Ligand SMILES: O=CN(O)CCCP(=O)(O)O
Ligand SMILES: [Mg+2]
């Protein structure tokens with residue numbers, strides 16, 4: 001199929017296949033991301049989906065039919081013996097009970113692809129308790145309780161990673177390159193073609209969501225900035241880069257303008273200092289990620305100028321693609337074959353994803369969910385978040401409004417209360433104790 | 437300096453530095469590329485230049501003065517005991533005797549940065565004979581005798597690699613990624629901003645060479661196509677990708693047109709078949725390298741289209757930079773720390789860099805050198821090369837014309853004779869005997 005000789009990670013995956021025992025993924029969630037992963041794995045060597053769960057059993061069969069064209073690879077399992085039988089018979093065992101997957105002895109690595117943060121919290125800690133590696137796609141959960149999950153993974157001798165293919169992990173590839181070379185990372189982040197619309201709600205997008213089948217919440221959280229705030233917080237929390245101002249600058253800049261824009265004001269850009277996470281509004285940046293780096297030696301500056309990388313001392317490194325869920329099996333391969341993580345949070349977070357009201361709300365109302373009507377994410381430094389008593393955005397779904405809140409106002413422990421009994425609130429309390 | 441926490445390779449280098457015994461490079465050649473490597477290593481952790489040689493000892497001191505601003509780090513050594521003392525004192529030992537570097541017990545890896553293929557052949561086999569890893573920057577030598585060097589490296593238990601940062605090795609990063617994902621590699625290569633000029637000579641470039649203080653042969657070999665032929669042959673001989681036609685198509689195509697141009701004729705492109713090395717003439721491809729890949733599943737096509745990566749089933753993956761000599765220390769780090777090569781030739785070459793005359797020549801004339809007046813490189817498949825009895829281009833410097841040759845004609849064992857005594861012709865004979 002590939003037309004090429006096997007090299008690097010491809011060759012390692014071919015050698016694994018030759019052992020007769022593939023790397024086996026337990027995949028939790030059969031929606032769009034999950035369905036993508038089944039499809040992607042079916043063309044790789046040495047890596048298989050052993051079992052697939054969803055809240056409703058029909059969805060597992062649906063994912064598998066979309067991947068293969070029919071449901072013949074699927075076999076329902078309601079017990080461990082049935083599941084292990086199915087896997088050894090070369091079937092994908094399907095179930096609506098996540099615990100059968102999380103506890104099966106043949107499963108090497110867990111991927112949660114449900115897009116539900118509370119669920120990413122629940123399944124993540126259970127995967128670690130059961131002695132399985134854990135590949136996290138729920139960035140909303142990672143930026144809330146990632147440090148805690150990583151510490152628990154270390155105690156059990158397993159690996160925790162964000163999955164490759166999304167902007168934060170793609171951007172870590174560039175960051176590792178620039179910093180291994182000893183260069184200053186001035187700014188890093190992602191682009192957007194068009195201005196954000198912070199007032200967006202599902203009323204503006206229901207029509208498009210319906211025609212494209214897709215979850216209207218995704219459009220909304222994309223357009224209102226929330227996903228951008230979350231992705232940039234994950235980069236910050238893995239590096240020590242910080243937002244320069246709450247919400248970031250988000251200037252207008254094409255790909256060719258980043259290196260004169262997301263740089264210090266002293267050198268003509270918009271930043272108060274070097275070492276930031278930010279994003280741009282303009283052409284040619286998306287669908288990838290970037291790092292603006294500085295050169296510290298005149299010879300290195302000259303060499304990059306001769307190669308037409310730019311005009312120094314600031315230079316833009318672009319990765320012009322990210323394939324989302326399709327890259328996540330490469331993380332699985334590196335984790336199991338090489339014992340390497342693609343991306344972990346630092347022990348001490350430097351940014352918090354906070355939230356701002358999208359409309360006026362009164363005491364007794366409930367906050368809804370990201371990508372809906374009540375609030376949108378807003379990145380702050382930890383010290384500014386704490387000073388303002390901001391509630392982490394991952395805690396807010398179905399939270400209670402306790403004092404009047406006006407449009408544009410920060411959501412805080414003074415004006416709202418999270419549902420106290422969430423797994424995610426419980427794990428975040430444990431994280432806060434561990435840090436203190 | 438970097439503004440970021442240590443991750444990945446950057447972390448592995450810092451951990452090496454904490455052992456107090458850095459990875460030590462033996463660097464042969466104090467000119468431009470060698471001076472770049474001294475400068476670049478000086479900003480990194482865990483890796484140092486232990487020793488540096490040049491034909492004329494003053495040029496070692498000159499390279500050191502450029503990198504550091506003074507010669508305090510240099511110490512002259514003409515014996516093993518003096519070189520080892522200098523390295524232990526934290527100096528870069530400088531010498532005019534390559535054999536001292538090739539045989540010093542404290543040197544881990546050899547890099548030949550002279551740009552002379554004969555010397556890359558000579559120091560290459562010597563490095564391997566002395567039990568040292570070998571990073572080759574001389575792509576002209578690698579395409580001539582690489583399979584032999586690789587086989588001898590394997591016999592000695594050391595690693596052979598092309599150095600990162602040049603088009604062939606940068607392109608291998610993309611090929612590894614697409615092929616690990618199970619995707620079809622349709623075409624791979626590099627771009628040039630402007631059309632080739634096959635008739636170029638140093639007469640045309642002496643003013644640019646003079647004002648840029650650079651070797652006029654490098655401009656000529658760039659413009660007349662020779663460097664592109666060599667670089668594409670390296671990719672082909674590492675992958676099994678082949679030139680579609682002798683010389684390659686080299687169509688007019690911007691970055692945004694690659695995926696409708698370097699694809700099969702049946703789908704509107706220029707190629708007779710999928711699985712090729714080629715290049716483009718047009719805007720936005722250089723500096724950098726590309727792979728055109730094909731999707732063979734509707735869901736994968738649909739995901740790449742929704743991400744705006746292109747319109748399927750063909751998609752362009754671009755790495756919009758390559759830093760030349762600056763990335764070579766990354767190869768050195770991967771080789772020593774992880775035992776991984778960045779790029780090796782396959783055991784059976786599929787392409788040959790041959791040569792065509794730039795002017796009419798008479799029996800008894802000598803061929804000059806690449807980037808001068810007499811000849812320019814031209815990629816062919818191995819079977820076509822053999823059928824024409826073509827001489828590998830790397831063997832031709834100072835060769836003798838034995839039958840009349842017309843401008844544009846292939847140089848073959850029927851109309852020319854290499855200098856027989858070269859280490860490079862001697863090693864090539866051994867490669868041919870190994871492959872017989
Ligand atoms: O991984 C994919 N994305 O982040 C796309 C979400 C749209 P945005 O880039 O507008 O937040
Ligand atoms: Mg994303």
Ligand SMILES: [Mg+2]
Pocket residue numbers: 602603667
């Ligand atoms: Mg090159």
